């Protein structure tokens, strides 16, 4: 806070500026960043090792831009799916590519940021978005003829009861609370789950920064 003799620290500012600058200038190309040593299963850049459960899927499968580099327009309007989704969810889960912006420092051109519109468990989101976990090796491309076989969706309704009992004590508290104010109605108190809907963990999160309203 304010004490009348307080010294003017200059270098505090200098280091902020200089650090931000050396950050922007040395900001790593994601070509080298997610680069992976397949023998040791170790990132050169971060020195990080990959989790045991991801090993096989790393050896045997391909990252997104590995399947998008050999596409003619670099794969616009194409449908893409993820191995994990195919194993867990029997309903269709795909990404439709809106933009693709590869990273060219790469000799083999395997890396880059993507965008699109997502269908998960058959439900479709109405907006464009940046796709998440591109660098992963789970990615697969669906062929043109099979496109209309995957996009084929059998629409089924949801059977989970809209309401459930309150937990035993809480129910008692509510009962007694309404007896006290002279409400005689013995209609069971019910807990309404309409807004308690949550997406399974597989559902990809938006990388886009939030606009504050």
């Amino acid at each position: 806070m304010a004490r009348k003799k307080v010294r003017p620290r200059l270098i505090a500012e200098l280091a902020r500026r200089v650090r931000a600058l050396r950050e922007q200038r040395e900001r790593p190309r994601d070509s080298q960043r997610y680069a992976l040593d397949y023998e040791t299963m170790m990132r050169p850049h971060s020195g990080n090792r990959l989790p045991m459960r991801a090993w096989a899927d790393v050896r045997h499968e391909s990252r997104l831009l590995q399947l998008l580099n050999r596409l003619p327009l670099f794969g616009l309007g194409r449908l893409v799916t993820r191995k994990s989704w195919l194993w867990q969810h029997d309903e269709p889960c795909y990404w439709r590519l809106t933009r693709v912006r590869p990273d060219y420092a790469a000799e083999n051109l395997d890396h880059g940021k993507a965008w699109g519109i997502l269908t998960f468990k058959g439900k479709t989101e109405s907006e464009a978005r940046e796709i998440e976990q591109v660098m992963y090796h789970d990615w697969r491309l669906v062929p043109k003829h099979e496109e209309e076989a995957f996009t084929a969706f059998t629409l089924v309704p949801e059977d989970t009861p809209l309401s459930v009992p309150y937990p035993p004590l809480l129910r008692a508290m509510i009962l007694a609370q309404r007896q006290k104010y002279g409400d005689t109605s013995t209609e069971e108190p019910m807990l309404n789950l309409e807004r308690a809907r949550i997406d399974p963990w597989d559902y990809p999160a938006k990388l886009e920064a939030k606009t504050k309203t």
Binding site: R70, L73, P102, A105, P143
Partner: protein, 388 residues
Amino acid sequence: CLLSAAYVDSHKWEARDKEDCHLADLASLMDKTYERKLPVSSLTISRFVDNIASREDIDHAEYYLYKFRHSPNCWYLRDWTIHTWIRQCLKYGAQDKALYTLKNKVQYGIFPDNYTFNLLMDYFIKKENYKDALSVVFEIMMQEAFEVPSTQLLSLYVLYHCLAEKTDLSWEEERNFGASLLLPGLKQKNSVGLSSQLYGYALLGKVELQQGLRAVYCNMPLLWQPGYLHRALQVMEKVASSPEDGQLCGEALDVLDRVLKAVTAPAQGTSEEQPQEGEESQRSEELVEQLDVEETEQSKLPQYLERFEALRSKLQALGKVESESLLTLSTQLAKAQLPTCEAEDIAVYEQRLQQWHGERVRLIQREQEQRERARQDYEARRAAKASA
């Protein structure tokens, strides 16, 4: 053959190059932009590819197209520039470098999804050169390029090679062939398209049963779903309501399949003894794509053998469509359908040719407008100087 000659290719391409540029000036401007690490217009490249007089300058074209596809604008290559490069190769050798940039694919980033593939293929047919036309077929299939009936042109070719096949095919060869039968055959017009579909589904079925399902779809535009033989037998089920199958080679190949599936069962040491590579590494790294409930295809063999024996008894007795040769009959078919399809392509490809010129014109206009604005603001800042 009819396509190329009757299309008047050379006249249009000679008519196309309007630009009047220099190769050394473009090379220095480019090299400069890559030195300072900045982007490069697709215009400079289209120009540089238009102005090539020599094989050496085609080498230089290759180099600068590479070093362009490794630059920020690599998605901005248009069709007419790719076209220019193909036609320049047609001016010189056409049979080497175009095939090398197509097989390289990803590096050079030509990706001519177009009538251009048809063009290249015809320029192979005229001059013979089978094997290289085959590889180009494979790459047109890998890019899954058929909205055009290059398919027939390719189906034709593949079926030529289909007779040119007497050999013992390895894993990747069998795969390649299955894919070149399947993805090119879309044809509902004829029996031959359908029985080439049968051929493909059969070959890929062999690939599956012998090695693994993963071997099939790995890099190929195919589906990971295990049923394949079932898809073929479904196409043979379509014959109850439909006239035609071509159906000699369906017989022959599905006979070879049924014979290897049979022979593998009683003789374990004859059929399955061939993979010695690593037992401990393959047992430890063993992965299973298939579920426990999924009913592995190897357990369905008694049904398959029945269907192919039931269905082949029906088809020949009902459809009566047994072909005496697939090679020749297909050849006749696509040679018959060829001319009208040409006549339909000529109309479109022309409008594309004018469109591309409109685009180039607009873009040069933008170049000029920009440069003039930059010169006016430069004169305004140089004549009267105000800076902080």
